[PDB]
Design an enzyme around this catalytic site. Structure first.
Site, short mmCIF file in Angstrom:
data_model
loop_
_atom_site.label_atom_id
_atom_site.label_comp_id
_atom_site.label_asym_id
_atom_site.label_seq_id
_atom_site.Cartn_x
_atom_site.Cartn_y
_atom_site.Cartn_z
N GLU A 1 0.83 -1.19 0.00
CA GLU A 1 0.00 0.00 0.00
C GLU A 1 0.87 1.24 0.00
OE1 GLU A 1 -2.89 -0.03 3.10
OE2 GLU A 1 -3.62 1.99 2.65
N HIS B 1 -1.95 11.27 -0.58
CA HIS B 1 -1.87 10.17 -1.54
C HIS B 1 -1.53 10.68 -2.94
CE1 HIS B 1 -3.20 7.43 1.47
NE2 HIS B 1 -3.49 6.47 0.61
N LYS C 1 -7.69 -0.52 11.41
CA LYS C 1 -7.10 -0.92 10.13
C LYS C 1 -5.84 -0.09 9.84
CE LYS C 1 -6.78 -1.27 5.42
NZ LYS C 1 -5.59 -0.80 4.64
N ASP D 1 3.72 -14.55 12.19
CA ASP D 1 2.40 -14.99 11.75
C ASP D 1 1.44 -13.81 11.77
OD1 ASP D 1 -0.30 -15.98 11.83
OD2 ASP D 1 0.52 -17.97 12.25
C1 LIG Z 1 2.07 11.32 3.03
C2 LIG Z 1 2.61 12.42 3.95
C3 LIG Z 1 3.72 11.84 4.82
C4 LIG Z 1 3.16 13.57 3.10
O1 LIG Z 1 4.03 14.34 3.88
P1 LIG Z 1 3.81 15.98 4.00
O2 LIG Z 1 2.48 16.26 4.67
O3 LIG Z 1 3.79 16.58 2.63
O4 LIG Z 1 5.04 16.60 4.89
P2 LIG Z 1 6.62 16.53 4.43
O5 LIG Z 1 6.71 16.12 2.98
O6 LIG Z 1 7.26 17.89 4.60
O7 LIG Z 1 7.43 15.44 5.35
C5 LIG Z 1 6.70 14.53 6.11
C6 LIG Z 1 7.55 13.42 6.59
O8 LIG Z 1 6.90 12.12 6.13
C7 LIG Z 1 8.02 11.36 5.44
N1 LIG Z 1 7.88 11.40 4.05
C8 LIG Z 1 7.22 12.37 3.42
N2 LIG Z 1 7.28 12.12 2.08
C9 LIG Z 1 8.04 10.87 1.94
C10 LIG Z 1 8.46 10.07 0.90
N3 LIG Z 1 8.13 10.44 -0.47
N4 LIG Z 1 9.16 8.98 1.14
C11 LIG Z 1 9.47 8.65 2.40
N5 LIG Z 1 9.09 9.38 3.45
C12 LIG Z 1 8.39 10.47 3.26
C13 LIG Z 1 9.28 12.02 5.86
O9 LIG Z 1 9.75 11.40 7.10
C14 LIG Z 1 8.94 13.43 6.08
O10 LIG Z 1 9.83 14.04 7.06
P3 LIG Z 1 11.44 14.11 6.73
O11 LIG Z 1 12.09 12.78 6.90
O12 LIG Z 1 11.67 14.57 5.32
O13 LIG Z 1 12.09 15.08 7.69
C15 LIG Z 1 1.47 12.96 4.81
O14 LIG Z 1 0.44 13.43 3.97
C16 LIG Z 1 0.91 11.85 5.69
O15 LIG Z 1 1.49 11.50 6.66
N6 LIG Z 1 -0.33 11.24 5.29
C17 LIG Z 1 -0.92 10.16 6.07
C18 LIG Z 1 -1.40 9.11 5.08
C19 LIG Z 1 -1.53 7.73 5.73
O16 LIG Z 1 -1.76 7.61 6.89
N7 LIG Z 1 -1.36 6.57 4.88
C20 LIG Z 1 -1.48 5.23 5.44
C21 LIG Z 1 -2.30 4.40 4.46
S1 LIG Z 1 -3.97 5.11 4.35
C22 LIG Z 1 -4.84 4.65 5.89
O17 LIG Z 1 -4.24 4.56 6.91
C23 LIG Z 1 -6.34 4.36 5.83
C24 LIG Z 1 -7.11 5.27 6.78
C25 LIG Z 1 -6.54 6.68 6.70
O18 LIG Z 1 -8.45 5.28 6.40
C26 LIG Z 1 -6.98 4.75 8.21
C27 LIG Z 1 -7.76 5.68 9.14
O19 LIG Z 1 -8.83 6.19 8.75
O20 LIG Z 1 -7.34 5.91 10.30
N1 LIG Z 2 -9.69 3.31 4.37
C1 LIG Z 2 -8.63 2.52 3.76
O1 LIG Z 2 -8.39 1.48 4.22
C2 LIG Z 2 -7.78 3.02 2.56
C3 LIG Z 2 -7.49 4.40 2.46
C4 LIG Z 2 -6.70 4.91 1.40
C5 LIG Z 2 -6.23 4.03 0.43
N2 LIG Z 2 -6.51 2.61 0.50
C6 LIG Z 2 -5.99 1.78 -0.56
O2 LIG Z 2 -6.61 2.24 -1.88
C7 LIG Z 2 -6.71 1.04 -2.82
C8 LIG Z 2 -8.14 0.63 -3.10
O3 LIG Z 2 -8.83 1.68 -3.71
P1 LIG Z 2 -9.16 1.75 -5.30
O4 LIG Z 2 -9.56 0.49 -5.83
O5 LIG Z 2 -10.33 2.58 -5.56
O6 LIG Z 2 -7.82 2.22 -6.10
P2 LIG Z 2 -7.84 2.47 -7.71
O7 LIG Z 2 -6.73 1.76 -8.31
O8 LIG Z 2 -7.47 3.84 -8.01
O9 LIG Z 2 -9.35 2.19 -8.31
C9 LIG Z 2 -9.70 1.11 -9.14
C10 LIG Z 2 -9.01 1.19 -10.49
O10 LIG Z 2 -9.47 0.04 -11.35
C11 LIG Z 2 -10.08 0.64 -12.58
N3 LIG Z 2 -11.14 -0.25 -12.98
C12 LIG Z 2 -11.11 -1.05 -14.06
N4 LIG Z 2 -12.23 -1.76 -14.11
C13 LIG Z 2 -13.02 -1.38 -12.96
C14 LIG Z 2 -14.24 -1.74 -12.43
N5 LIG Z 2 -15.08 -2.71 -13.09
N6 LIG Z 2 -14.63 -1.15 -11.32
C15 LIG Z 2 -13.90 -0.26 -10.69
N7 LIG Z 2 -12.73 0.10 -11.14
C16 LIG Z 2 -12.25 -0.40 -12.26
C17 LIG Z 2 -10.42 2.06 -12.20
O11 LIG Z 2 -10.51 2.92 -13.38
P3 LIG Z 2 -11.42 4.30 -13.33
O12 LIG Z 2 -10.80 5.37 -12.58
O13 LIG Z 2 -11.68 4.88 -14.64
O14 LIG Z 2 -12.73 4.10 -12.74
C18 LIG Z 2 -9.31 2.46 -11.29
O15 LIG Z 2 -8.17 2.98 -12.07
C19 LIG Z 2 -5.94 -0.02 -2.05
O16 LIG Z 2 -4.50 0.07 -2.36
C20 LIG Z 2 -6.19 0.29 -0.60
O17 LIG Z 2 -5.32 -0.46 0.34
C21 LIG Z 2 -7.29 2.13 1.60
#
Ligand SMILES: CC(C)(COP(=O)([O-])OP(=O)([O-])OC[C@H]1O[C@@H](n2cnc3c(N)ncnc32)[C@H](O)[C@@H]1OP(=O)([O-])[O-])[C@@H](O)C(=O)NCCC(=O)NCCSC(=O)C[C@@](C)(O)CC(=O)[O-]
Ligand SMILES: NC(=O)c1ccc[n+]([C@@H]2O[C@H](COP(=O)([O-])OP(=O)(O)OC[C@H]3O[C@@H](n4cnc5c(N)ncnc54)[C@H](OP(=O)(O)O)[C@@H]3O)[C@@H](O)[C@H]2O)c1
Ligand SMILES: NC(=O)c1ccc[n+]([C@@H]2O[C@H](COP(=O)([O-])OP(=O)(O)OC[C@H]3O[C@@H](n4cnc5c(N)ncnc54)[C@H](OP(=O)(O)O)[C@@H]3O)[C@@H](O)[C@H]2O)c1
Ligand SMILES: [Ca+2]
Ligand SMILES: [Ca+2]
Ligand SMILES: [Ca+2]
Lengths: 358, 425
Positions: free
Chosen positions: B90, B380, B267, B283
């Protein structure tokens, strides 16, 4: 700079600084996933983890044969699935649904109902904005399906969005749609405050129910087929009483489910979160399956939320995900969920039968 | 009609069953029976893990799944700096973990326990309270048999530590075993110890019946609790650091009211936890099972972390059961596990659990800050624009230049990112 370096430069920096041994570096360099793909998927990439992949055998779902790609590091998991599916012979879909869920949560809401009644009378405009924030999914035939409202204590209000994302997992579709509608809300209610807009991984509207009917004779090579069934039934009911057994009970199920989810490039954390949360029935963590005796048949049923995907995420960019998808050969995401739910129930059968036979 | 399964087509009965064939023979059979294409077979054949290792770890082995592995940065636990191996598919997970750790600066341990549970369950018990007392007084010999059923662990300093008893439905009885399995996960140590103690339970009571004897993945005696304290000013590049902290508290509080949010909340935590668990060869099912079950409190699935404000400080705390391992299972037979272990540089399994719990809390911080601030999408898309730049060949400071221009485009692409790059050169 580390996040800006190349994978080759990051490994050298780690070795030069005494953070990894020389043998550790050579092992990190022994990769099969292209460096181009891996380096652009994640951040600070240096190497890969290799999980062995095998073939689960004898799964039949609604009179269709399947070969299950299973990525797992635990022995006997793939053999258990194969023996469990062979004993069950086949699985049958009781019901399936596939919608994703998201929410926009207001906070410090003066009068919740006021805010809610305001939104219900403008639902046509909300659907309009939701289409504009991601029109591609509406052209594919999906899009927003329903709006729901929940007023909580402490002045929270949640607007629930149920979306049809077709064959994708839908995270990026739902998040984009919600942030777009959030803008409209802030325009409509400058008074109110929005805490966040995000997708919910608790996909209670993507639940799949599979079942199987097993002649008790198939549970043993010998005569005690009914005895093994009665103890399987007893073990399943004890999971409903002892969470310490239910967790192991469901862990056994996820050994099969998470192996297929992983092998196909799907999000393992998402499926593990929804399934285990779905196990909470009546304020108690219980088993995700039920086993009962109806005459000379052992009947098992499973119910799990499986918002899986055949497109998007890592299902395509990882070549191994495409290879595993070729082996499984499911035509759409709904079918993938049915096959995965059957694997879960088959895994559970093999686990319980071994548990009570020793 | 009801024809047999198409697997009995893979056997070469003129010679060999599928589970007996070599990986190469298993792939050739798959192609010859119309189950995979030639290109799929060649992709399956492109593996980095030794074929001899993979084939003897699982059954019906044919290939391997490859998960990219990166390094999370800026994590500090008990005044020690770490480099966290993170295996994940991811995007933004690793960058978010680094951002979250950097914002928090460090994490400290509040409490920690490490004992694996097991259980021997009696069924059809007439008087549960009777059999229980009949067992409590003979605990001296229960501890003795446990040692001989598996002596290796006792000489390494571990073994059975406690015995507890519970009754359900006035007909089930469960003997709970608390075992110290040292640096292993404990599955085979416990199971063998319980199956050996079950034996004498039968010899002692030919009247009663045992339903099963097996470990419990619900490791409530392996809970580790981590804490962090962040000056509210660190939560924003602007001047509203406190405002952000107040919103994080409410988001954490809201997770405790709406299970639909709590699941997503946890998550996000597990995105980091499972990424280290997988990289170190542990595991992943056991951890997510015990962690999500532990999330259930007062009959309600809630968030695994708490966030509160204490003056000018944002206080975060995580509590999860992490019966992780540094030996056994796949922690050593998989070379990448050892390489990841060399990078993390932990000395024992207790320290592993402490670092992983802190990773979870840092991961939670990054997600919550983004959710209540600019939103999850902005981050993102930014990483996505940089990824699309490197794909087409962006190098040096051209990575940000091409990403800046991709932002202006209503829809970013590889087709268009290459055009932007060529113009710059
Ligand atoms: C994505 C950032 C970090 C952007 O980062 P930013 O806001 O633009 O700030 P920055 O670019 O000035 O630096 C932020 C720091 O993050 C690191 N960092 C920054 N850019 C990079 C990079 N290219 N490669 C490696 N590390 C990076 C890096 O450590 C950096 O500090 P530094 O080391 O430079 O002093 C910020 O927007 C962020 O933290 N977003 C959070 C997104 C997230 O949590 N993703 C996890 C997967 S999505 C998820 O969890 C599902 C969810 C969200 O639904 C769960 C929930 O609801 O709770
Ligand atoms: N709350 C969370 O847990 C969370 C938060 C942030 C990100 N994520 C991550 O985001 C990803 C899942 O989201 P996503 O699927 O929407 O990413 P996505 O890759 O951007 O969306 C699906 C892609 O498949 C294409 N596509 C082809 N056939 C399709 C069909 N029949 N239906 C739908 N799409 C089709 C879409 O094209 P078109 O654009 O033209 O429709 C699109 O480019 C995962 O990597 C997940 O782990 C999760
Ligand atoms: N319900 C379940 O989840 C379940 C059920 C069954 C099996 N499993 C699987 O069984 C494995 C986990 O069990 P396990 O850990 O006991 O595997 P294990 O490999 O059999 O046990 C640990 C190994 O590490 C050695 N060792 C070296 N230093 C040690 C130390 N300080 N502490 C403990 N051991 C040390 C032990 O030596 P000695 O031989 O001398 O003792 C032993 O060979 C996993 O593959 C797991 O998925 C899980
Ligand atoms: Ca409605
Ligand atoms: Ca095929
Ligand atoms: Ca006691």
């Amino acid at each position: 700079r580390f996040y800006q370096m190349s994978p080759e430069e990051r490994l050298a920096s780690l070795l030069n600084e005494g953070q990894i041994s020389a043998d550790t570096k050579k092992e990190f360099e022994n990769t099969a996933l292209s460096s181009q793909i891996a380096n652009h998927m994640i951040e600070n990439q240096i190497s890969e983890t290799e999980v062995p992949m095998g073939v689960g055998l004898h799964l039949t779902v609604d009179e269709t044969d399947y070969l299950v790609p299973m990525a797992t590091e635990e022995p006997s998991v793939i053999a258990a699935l194969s023996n469990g599916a062979k004993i069950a012979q086949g699985f049958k879909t009781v019901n399936q649904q596939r919608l994703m869920r998201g929410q926009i949560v207001f906070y410090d809401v003066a009068d919740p109902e006021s805010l809610i009644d305001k939104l219900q009378v403008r639902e046509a405009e909300i659907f309009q904005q939701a289409e504009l924030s991601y029109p591609s999914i509406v052209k594919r035939g999906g899009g927003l399906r329903d709006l729901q409202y929940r007023a909580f204590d402490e002045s929270f209000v949640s607007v629930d969005f149920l979306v049809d994302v077709k064959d994708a997992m839908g995270a990026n579709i739902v998040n984009a749609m919600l942030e777009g509608v959030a803008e409209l809300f802030r325009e409509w209610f400058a008074e109110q405050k929005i805490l966040f807009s995000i997708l919910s991984n608790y996909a209670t509207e993507s639940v799949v129910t599979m079942k199987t009917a097993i002649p008790v004779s198939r549970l043993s090579k010998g005569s005690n087929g009914r005895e093994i069934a009665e103890k399987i039934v007893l073990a399943s009911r004890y999971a409903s009483l002892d969470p310490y057994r239910a967790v192991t009970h469901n862990k056994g199920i996820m050994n099969g489910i998470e192996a297929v989810v992983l092998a196909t490039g799907n999000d393992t954390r998402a499926v593990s979160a929804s399934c285990h949360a779905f196990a909470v029935k009546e304020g108690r963590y219980q088993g995700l399956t039920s086993w009962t005796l109806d005459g000379e048949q052992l009947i098992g049923e499973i119910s799990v939320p499986l918002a899986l995907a055949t497109v998007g995420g890592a299902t395509k960019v990882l070549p191994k995900s495409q290879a595993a998808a070729d082996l499984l050969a499911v035509t759409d995401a709904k079918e993938l969920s049915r096959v995965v739910a059957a694997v879960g129930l088959a895994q559970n059968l093999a686990a319980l039968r071994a548990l009570v036979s020793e």
